Symmetry: C3
Subunit: 251 residues, 3 copies
């Protein structure tokens, strides 16, 4: 039970996906005792997994598993392996390490629709949950994706068997996807998503508190959010509950 | 004893109040071995307490108690409970969990002077230290408070039995209270406080290092500061001692 | 071995120097199991050492030593001790605590060339590795140092027996040394360094990810970097390896 349980009001709580960019192992064990109940998935950011000791990676995945949290490596790592013709070795290693999900992305590389479709299907066939990601890392490339382009890709990924589709904003949440150079949500672009796709299948990267607030006020506390800093999981739950100033009386 | 004890010069050290927005329990135990000697009070930010496991909350309060640190829940949580007519249940739970203090605020809700006075007195009557808070969360509301308004409220709260009064700046320290949109201290507004209230009874929220520096240079190292990030307690003590560049030779 | 070891490509990896501004002791023990292999040196920032319990300082130095990491106190602490005529007591305490290196700087105080030369030599004579630092803490003083001034001081310090010379940018990485008010690298100033000094003897403070990216793209992954946040050591290694978006395919 929570402290002040008498104040709790039941609600439809969206997904929380954390960015883990290299948390220490015992720290993860400790940390989950405070906020493990509010984490659904964790991304080991980009290629961070590939720099960490193999047993430490396995260890961490188990700690998350003790709280029912599925872990995936970043799509950037998939893209690196894919570009080297080592996608199979990538899936095999993922299975051996214990990742329950994989992210398929094309943020840093050119992957055709057919290649993308087939990578999703191969990952699914191997028993992984699959999250895809729509967006490009670099602003010159990302700018070439219109909102209608993003919508088409979301539904393409779902058709291929993706479980969820992530809308990219990077850890910075600046100048990429739905966010302008100052990190403010592009309201018009976001409306065109709200009316064209199944929002329950979409996860919005929202690393900044101001972004989390904007998404909660627009879609409700049922909104799915990703790239949540590990130390803002509790904050995010308070925002969903109207127990932080930004959403008090508004949720 | 401290390392390099021969360099230490005794001084009048103001209060340090930390923002704990959800630190893990064993981490707190470990963390206090480094900087517990420089923490007076800790705020479990806003309604964070109300999302955390009850035994974990109790556990953390005890760890802080082992270093002589008093803990209070955020005034935002008080405001939520108060607005639901559950202030009594709120005080009872606070006592059961072990909080030694409570924050009374009106940052997100309308609380009249009489209601405010009576809430302070009720908390005091129940054995809590009471810290009040002056300010509004949202800039449209906060702007309506003039400096003279803030001064009047400080002394009203003290009259009611408040132990300390906190000047609100939020965790961001931007666009609220004494800080402009860029987080810079409003020097003129601050002078009008320096000459009209007992500064020893006031605690300034100062989440940004630049704010801590501004307050130390204005009032001295005896200044009371709040919303100090957990990982900047040591930094803050070095600033008070002139052992970081910003205050070297100036304190 | 690392996870996804089959993706690893050997490369010339520059130094990583971490800023430790007060990490808890058991946290350090845990933290090094994830990224201790990618840390060469750690700076206990400025005078932080002088506020921490002496046995905790010794304890931490040992944890770092278990991963082959040398620790030094900040040059600001040296400057304080030096200004009080307690440089000898400073070196003795450093030896007793277990620091394997010392930083000699003049960021907050006036130290002549002869005084600087002699302090370097005294530290070396006492068995310390010596890192010096070029730059001033305050922008009004730092602006008076031209690039040619910095180059001359680098080689002066090396002549005196310095092991490395650090180019100062502070923890903020703003408005000081090679960085403008917005934290962007001054490309022209940096070119004049690239062509005039032994870059292998220089360590660039680069607290911001954007700075780390700029230095890696300019000098390569062999570049030496300092003031790396403890939680960005893994990120930095991924950047060196082209496994984060910013340097994917560029390294």
């Amino acid at each position: 039970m929570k402290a002040f349980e008498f104040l709790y009001e039941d609600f439809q709580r969206g997904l929380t996906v954390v960015l883990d960019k290299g948390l220490p192992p015992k720290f993860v064990e400790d940390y989950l005792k405070v906020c493990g109940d509010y984490i659904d998935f964790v991304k080991f950011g980009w290629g961070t997994s590939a720099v960490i000791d193999r047993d430490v990676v396995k260890e961490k995945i188990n700690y998350y598993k003790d709280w029912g949290i599925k872990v995936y490596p970043g799509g950037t790592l998939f893209e690196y392996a894919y570009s080297k013709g080592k996608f199979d070795e990538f899936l095999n290693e993922c299975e051996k390490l214990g990742f329950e999900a994989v992210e398929i992305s094309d943020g840093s590389s050119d992957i055709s629709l057919e290649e993308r479709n087939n990578a999703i299907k191969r990952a699914k066939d191997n028993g992984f949950m699959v999250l895809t990601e729509v967006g490009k890392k670099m602003p010159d490339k990302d700018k070439q994706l219109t909102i209608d382009d993003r919508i088409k890709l979301i539904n393409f990924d779902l058709d291929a068997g993706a479980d969820y589709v992530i809308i990219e904003g990077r850890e910075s949440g600046k100048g990429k996807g739905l966010f302008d150079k100052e990190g403010k949500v592009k309201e018009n672009e976001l409306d065109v998503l709200a009316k064209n796709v199944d929002i329950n299948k979409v996860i919005f990267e929202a690393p900044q508190k101001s972004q989390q607030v904007a998404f909660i006020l627009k879609f409700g506390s049922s909104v799915n959010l990703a790239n949540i800093a590990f130390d803002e999981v509790i904050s995010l739950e308070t925002l969903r509950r109207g127990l932080r100033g930004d959403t008090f009386g508004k949720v």
